[PDB]
């Protein structure tokens, strides 16, 4: 059907409050399925998806050992970047990284991703071609210079095109009832008068997957629209709505249009009293 | 599975 894989690493420093903290979560499409924390007294790779719990103990000991060495790897990375900017040892700093492979409808990769950050700023990234890098500042070149000679991008090109695609594919089959089956939203339109001349028309979309959805308000001539967007529900589905202030008296003229993957055809809604 | 070995910064 469709596939995507992402890994969200996060390493922050707490001078005086202990050692740096490392947090890692895994994603397939918009469904989180891995969770790891360094501060737990029992730090183990926890799962958040029903289809992965099938994996044996060697899988979970592997994922735990990897993160138990990445917490020492980024702790030195925090000390190294602290030296590049000669930042004070009493300052808190954070490093964030994202990577993963993207599978295509044919079955092979389309775009492999790898990117890091420091204090919320882009630090270093792997290019579209998996071989090179792109530095953001002067200090990024220091780390770039090391990975140029250690063939770090060589490891990623073999991982993103190898184990990542092989396992992102295995996850699609073990959970195809939910990962390859999209659920259209539960849509309805509400209304609440604000004044004698104005009125609020809110269009709801509930319980949909994946997260991508479009909600717009339109008068038969054209389209206008307050849009708080894509909050989660906690049941691995998301909720979203769009509202518009309409003149009370001419209310029926406004229409709501929904564009979603799970819908066979785009919907058009009108507030029916 | 995540990336097996990580470089440092």
């Amino acid at each position: 059907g469709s596939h995507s894989m992402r890994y969200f690493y996060t390493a922050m420093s707490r001078p005086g409050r202990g050692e740096p903290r490392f947090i890692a979560v895994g994603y397939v499409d918009d469904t989180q399925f891995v969770r790891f924390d360094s501060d737990a007294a029992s730090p183990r790779t926890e799962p958040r998806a029903p289809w992965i719990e099938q994996e044996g103990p060697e899988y979970w000991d592997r994922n735990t050992q990897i993160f138990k060495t990445n917490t020492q790897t980024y702790r030195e990375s925090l000390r190294n970047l602290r030296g590049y900017y000669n930042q004070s040892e009493a300052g808190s700093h954070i490093i964030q990284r994202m990577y993963g492979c993207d599978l295509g409808p044919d079955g092979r990769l389309l775009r492999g991703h790898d990117q890091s950050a420091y204090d919320g700023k882009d630090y270093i990234a792997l290019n579209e071609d998996l071989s090179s890098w792109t530095a953001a500042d002067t200090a990024a070149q220091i780390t770039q210079r090391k990975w140029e000679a250690a063939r770090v991008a060589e490891q990623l090109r073999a991982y993103l095109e190898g184990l990542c695609v092989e396992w992102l594919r295995r996850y699609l089959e073990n959970g195809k009832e939910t990962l390859q089956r999209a659920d259209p939203p539960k849509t309805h339109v509400t209304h609440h008068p604000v004044s004698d001349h104005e009125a609020t028309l809110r269009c709801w979309a509930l319980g949909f997957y994946p997260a991508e959805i479009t909600l717009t308000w339109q008068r038969d001539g054209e389209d206008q629209t307050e849009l708080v967007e894509t909050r989660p529900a906690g049941d691995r589905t998301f909720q979203k709505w769009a509202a518009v202030v309409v003149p009370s008296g001419e209310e029926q003229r406004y229409t709501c249009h929904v564009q979603h993957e799970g819908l066979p055809k785009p919907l058009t809604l009108r507030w029916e009293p | 599975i995540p990336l097996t070995e990580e470089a440092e910064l």
Partner: T-cell receptor, first 116, second 112 residues
Framework: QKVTQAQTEISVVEKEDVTLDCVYE???????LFWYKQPPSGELVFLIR??????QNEISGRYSWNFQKSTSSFNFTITASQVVDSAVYFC??????????????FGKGTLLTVNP | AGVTQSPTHLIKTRGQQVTLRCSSQ?????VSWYQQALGQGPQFIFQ???????GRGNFPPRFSGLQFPNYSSELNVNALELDDSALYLC???????????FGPGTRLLVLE
């Protein structure tokens, strides 16, 4: 998993092309292959690095390597063998054993001797 | 001078303590120790990373190790036996491309 070098010893003469046979078995897809030469001093020198996504044929100098994923073999070929090429050649495999570690696994060892 | 290993040859009696040392290259951060018998290939003892053991394979607890912040490593082996006589090789890498640059080795011999 395991690596196997069936050739125990090889006796060749100068200017003769000798090939070395190294086969591997490995279910996980991502791995890094290697070839090492060990002169009688005892140390191993770094010759080659091969990966899973690389090509089938690759030749450099008198050394000609043949990596194919169907046969799961990395058979090595030495063209116009000289006296200096007499040593022990190992092929290793960098797989995932346990976790967070790509460990190496060396084969039995092929003794190559070039007689005058 | 990236690859060194001291000493070269060593003779000890059955049931003693030996400490083999190794120096890493300027750009490397890992040390992997191996043991090569006369017929077999180099078998993988533990690998160290930033003074904390990374992973060990098929060796008893008496085989121990330690890594110093200046990229210097050791191999503290206890309770020697006659079969512990082998060639002990030292490797180095930097957590990037998995390439192991071996050292000159150490010919250890244990006698009764």
């Amino acid at each position: 998993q395991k690596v196997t070098q069936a050739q125990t010893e090889i006796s060749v003469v100068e200017k003769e092309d000798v090939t070395l046979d190294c086969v591997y078995e490995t279910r996980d897809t991502t791995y890094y292959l290697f070839w090492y030469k060990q002169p009688p001093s005892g140390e191993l020198v770094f010759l080659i690095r091969r990966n899973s996504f690389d090509e089938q044929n690759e030749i450099s100098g008198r050394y000609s390597w043949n990596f194919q994923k169907s046969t799961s073999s990395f058979n090595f070929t030495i063209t116009a063998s000289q006296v200096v090429d007499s040593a022990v050649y190992f092929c290793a495999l960098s797989h995932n054993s346990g976790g967070s570690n790509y460990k190496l696994t060396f084969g039995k060892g092929t003794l190559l001797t070039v007689n005058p | 001078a990236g690859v060194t290993q001291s000493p070269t040859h060593l003779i000890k009696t059955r049931g003693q303590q030996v400490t083999l040392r190794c120096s890493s290259q300027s750009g490397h951060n890992t040390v992997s120790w191996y043991q090569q018998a006369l017929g077999q290939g180099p078998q993988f003892i533990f690998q160290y990373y930033r003074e904390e053991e990374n992973g060990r394979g098929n060796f008893p607890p008496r085989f121990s190790g330690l890594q110093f912040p200046n990229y210097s490593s050791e191999l503290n082996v206890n309770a020697l036996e006659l079969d512990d006589s082998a060639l002990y090789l030292c490797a180095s890498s930097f957590r990037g491309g998995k390439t192991q640059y071996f050292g000159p080795g150490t010919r250890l011999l244990v006698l009764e």
